[PDB]
């Protein structure tokens, strides 16, 4: 019985608080009070329409064939205005909808299944999912979170442990390159890949003939932001404009560098294209802690499309040929590592051999360091990695790429003076210690912009410096003050994230507790009643579980990440796909299959609930006669785990065979059969460090490499003379090696003059910030 009034008419959803910093006035005051640098704002000319065939002559046929728009929009207007970037933050105080909704259906299903099943780990799984729903929130944070994040970046860069250039730490570019030959082994780009000698649009071959139509340019995310000067546009809306701007910037830089006044010309080009150094401060979508919603929002420094393209032309041809890591090469690098297809078992074999031989082990992946020492596994992360970066760290990376990557077999460069100018003299100051845009505020970026094309490379170099210093200090244990003292030594902040004790015993336990029943145990299509002990390496987010069926370790997503993903799944995040009938149900199937595939299969309660949900959806589709195989075959793009599990289809329900197939290695593994690094093959990181400590590798032997190192010390007014010193090697003239030797000697001699010594990175930053 209820009243007529009533008759007439699970954790609660998180509602973010009102954000007091959501206005330019309040945000600017907050930053001023916290002494965060706000730049004097710079203006961008309005857009002018130009004919595509005049601006991009190489693409005339594409315009004629109606495959490319006949006009391009470029910032050449008579009036210039200050740009404004207002990102959405969801959920927010006024809007708590489907975006960032926790999976309450899964929570109810986990509860129903726990009541029917006696899984000993079942109560803890339910408790963890409920706790993650109650304490976390998937979304794009807040203006307060973004602003507080900027303060933390400034604190890392300039606070307790101010940043140090590699030169202050005690490394020359050549010494760093010797370390990188070991920690980031690289191959040269393919001989058929064009050298760094051209305007980007010249790398497009279009005639209409499908058999030959090719682009030698890097691939791009079409739906991603164009960045400045095209706020609100995607890369798909602005590819022609990006080519025009990237061609103009490289062309103007090249002409200015060899002009009668290189300093005036180079500075003018940099000032005219200032916006190529300013990133849109995009709030990153993550599973944030509800109580810290306004205290921290991670940012993506959204690089201008032309800058992204020019930087990617230097890095991607090298990196595409350099998927060299500890599982296939004798290197600490984890670059290109996959724990699938036997990857985790190769890691476990290396770990087990190190433990058996009483050897220390180090692994590096960007801002992640892994140390095995004293029967303990340590996970060390750089503290807000990007904030530690100086333009000189990126310049050392450019030096490494141009000396070890962009080089011919005879030692001649695979670049001309224009590209050496962009790469060495300008590019590091475009994305490191430059600026970002939030609302109408042009803010200083402390360190490198997170998400720029060189993020991974720059972070990897910083971890390389920390590791080289660790080796130099006699490998102090990560839990000691001697290890923590490497922060001040390097100017790089870091923290011990994980300490996995009794490693040897943990591995024995993981093998012994491996279940006899279920997936990868006896190979049935059921989870184990009692999962075995995981080796919680958190190796790029992965733990290791022993398989009795396959007689190997296999990866499972680290528990906390698995629970967070189950509690707050990412939605479809594609309005076009979402409007197609069956895309939502297909995405729901994908979400439940992917959570099982990454590790849910080994969590009995989670596997039971997720299997039931995906089977129920498939059954409904079958009865209804609705075919979604198209979406299920091309599932990768609709899943946060899509990049992790390539080459598999979700059109058939997950079985033991799916788990066998994803873990199947192409080849057997022998760690002793791994090739040595392409450069200094016989040398180890320890031998290189010993050589450096003694004063070796200060200068490269190659005159071409000496010119490139001198390029990092000489002021911009010397660019025309530096171009003349490089022209013989760059043109591969007869006797270029002897000619380069004489020119590098003449240049080293003239460098005695201190008035010629100024970082072009400082000159670039000064020209970018000019008002
Ligand atoms: Cl940031
Ligand atoms: K620092």
Author numbering: 11 to 19, 31 to 792
Task: Kindly provide excerpts from the paper associated with this entry.
A second construct lacking the C-terminal 55 residues (ΔC55) was therefore cloned, expressed, purified and crystallised. These crystals diffracted well and the structure was solved by molecular replacement using the structure of IBDV VP1 as a search model. The IPNV polymerase closely resembles IBDV VP1, with an r.m.s. deviation in Cα positions of 1.2 Å over 678 residues. The structure of IPNV VP1 confirms the previously-identified rearrangement of the catalytic palm domain, with the non-canonical ADN catalytic motif (residues 387–389) lying at the apex of a β-hairpin in the active site. Strong electron density was observed near the outer edge of the palm domain, between the side chains of N184, N409 and N514 and the backbone carbonyl oxygen atoms of V177, N182 and G512. This feature, some 15 Å from the putative active site, was modeled as a K+ ion based on the strength of the electron density, the ligand-to-K+ distances of 2.6–2.8 Å and the hard nature of the six ligands. Additional electron density resembling a protein helix was observed in the active site cleft of both apo and Mg-bound ΔC55 VP1. Based on the presence of strong density suggesting a sulfur-containing methionine side chain, this helix was tentatively assigned as residues 11–19 from the otherwise-disordered N-terminal tail of the protein. As the 48 Å separating the final residue of the helix (M19) and the first residue of the polymerase domain (I31) is too great to be spanned by the intervening 10 residues, the N-terminal helix presumably derives from an adjacent polymerase domain in the crystal.
